[PDB]
Design a protein around this ligand. Structure first.
Ligand SMILES: [Ca+2]
Ligand SMILES: [Zn+2]
Ligand SMILES: [Zn+2]
Length: 157
């Protein structure tokens, strides 16, 4: 299953007080641009109406079958790309999100969750951001395994 449309939209339900929204929007917009920068897909932010991808922050159990068990376990998750709650993305607001090489980088995890919404799967390539184990990579850029994978599905820009 994949999006049949060539354009998609996204909306943030709220900004966590962990970091200013001005810094979060950039991190999120920067991730979408990295994906569109290599794919003919386009992402438009909407301040009203529904969004193919809804992003929100939740704490502890939030009406889901995958409650967060402390700072351990996964730091976030998303539903398969589909109507209803599908395509939604929840972030563990119990952890401390930062915008640099501190404990964790929100943009690194954001790109990872966005990769799943695109239908991408994990990989054993260390240079792949979809790597299961977290790793600090100087600059955050896409890998060829990821570019060829998303381009193979849609094509070149
Ligand atoms: Ca956790
Ligand atoms: Zn959830
Ligand atoms: Zn994953």
């Amino acid at each position: 299953p994949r999006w049949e449309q060539t354009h998609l939209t996204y909306r943030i339900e709220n900004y966590t007080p962990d970091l200013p929204r001005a810094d979060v929007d950039h991190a999120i917009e920067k991730a979408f641009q990295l994906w569109s920068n290599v794919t003919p897909l386009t992402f438009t932010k909407v301040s009203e109406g529904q969004a193919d991808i809804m992003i929100s922050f939740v704490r502890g159990d939030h009406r889901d079958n995958s409650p967060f068990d402390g700072p351990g376990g996964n730091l976030a998750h998303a539903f398969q790309p589909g109507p209803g709650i599908g395509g939604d993305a929840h972030f563990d607001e119990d952890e401390r999100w930062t915008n640099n090489f501190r404990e964790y980088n929100l943009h690194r995890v954001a790109a990872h969750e966005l990769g799943h919404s695109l239908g991408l799967s994990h990989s054993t390539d260390i240079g792949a951001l979809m790597y299961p184990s977290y790793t600090f990579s100087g600059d955050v850029q896409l890998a060829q395994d990821d570019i060829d994978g998303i381009q193979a599905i849609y094509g070149r820009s």
